[PDB]
Design a protein around this ligand. Structure first.
Ligand SMILES: [Ca+2]
Ligand SMILES: [Ca+2]
Ligand SMILES: [Ca+2]
Ligand SMILES: [Ca+2]
Length: 305
């Protein structure tokens, strides 16, 4: 819902660069190993994208900022301008865990405590790269932390493109303002609210919901607090970006081969993905033999959590 040509224009062209590079490399990938310029051009059409996505990413942030401020206003205009300043600070306190600075906290304040990004149709890798950065640690070494850092390293900006252009509309729908979720205004999402929210993001399976609730809720209390919500929130974005990065055939849904090459691309020991084959089937509930975002999500969890 961010209708602004300066951006639309910007997204349209960066695409041209990508649809170019994409098509360019397509060749190299099946040109007999005959006596590399493609390899040259590839590398060439690849830096431009970064530079272009870089400029585009900042125009997006500026919009979000304006959107957030513009929202805080409306809030005051309504009830007590301070009866709200608190809630945010009370909630934002639960992060008091990694080394989150004012800078990062604000990014989270925008993502998880306002509708500036929520359903705006846009998203910025730059903001996401920064947070995941100071969050990996929290995650013990292992597989899940690898999926995490794979998104951050942003190799060749392939992650940057998927976030800003390819699945930005989808990344903004997975995000939401905790205060709207929490329909009773205590700093914790109940089992009912949790469900109710997540059922409207493509998670209708009870079996999978409990999976998410079990993921978020660490201190183990039938309630979920903004800080855990933020935790579950960053995990879904991440897996959501990898789900597309793994749809090499653009068919819409991942498949055994595809999922394998990501856990592979990602550097995940075979000693950690052995029952993999059996699980994929377990998760693959409609038997399509492919996985939907909701299934890839159950999978990841099941295997590494
Ligand atoms: Ca609540
Ligand atoms: Ca809890
Ligand atoms: Ca596919
Ligand atoms: Ca399926």
């Amino acid at each position: 819902e961010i209708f602004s040509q300066e951006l639309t224009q910007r997204e349209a062209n960066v695409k041209k660069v990508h649809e170019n590079l994409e098509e360019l490399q397509k060749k190299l990938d099946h040109t007999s190993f005959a006596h590399d310029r493609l390899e040259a051009q590839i590398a060439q059409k690849e830096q431009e994208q970064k530079a272009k996505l870089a400029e585009y990413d900042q125009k997006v942030q500026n919009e979000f900022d304006a959107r957030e401020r513009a929202e805080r206003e409306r809030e005051a205009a309504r009830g007590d301008a301070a009866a709200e300043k608190q809630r945010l600070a009370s909630l934002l306190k639960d992060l008091e865990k990694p080394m989150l600075s004012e800078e990062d906290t604000n990014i989270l304040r925008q993502l998880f405590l306002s509708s500036a990004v929520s359903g705006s149709g846009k998203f910025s890798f730059q903001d996401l790269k920064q947070v995941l950065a100071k969050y990996a640690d929290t995650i013990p070494e292992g597989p899940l932390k690898k999926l995490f850092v794979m998104v951050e390293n942003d190799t060749k900006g392939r992650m940057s493109y998927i976030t800003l252009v390819a699945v930005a509309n989808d990344l903004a729908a997975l995000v939401a303002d905790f205060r709207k979720i929490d329909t009773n205004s205590n700093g914790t999402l109940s089992r009912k609210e949790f469900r109710e929210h997540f059922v409207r993001l493509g998670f209708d399976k009870k079996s999978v919901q409990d999976a998410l609730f079990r993921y978020a809720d660490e201190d183990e209390s039938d309630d979920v607090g903004f800080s855990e919500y933020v935790h579950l929130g960053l995990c879904l974005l991440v897996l959501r970006i990898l789900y597309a990065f793994a749809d090499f055939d653009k068919s819409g849904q991942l498949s055994k081969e595809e999922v394998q090459k990501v856990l592979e691309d990602a550097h995940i020991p075979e000693s950690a993905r052995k029952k993999f084959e059996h699980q994929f089937s377990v998760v693959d509930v409609d038997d399509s033999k492919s996985l939907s975002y909701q299934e890839f999500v159950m999978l990841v969890l099941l295997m590494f959590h």
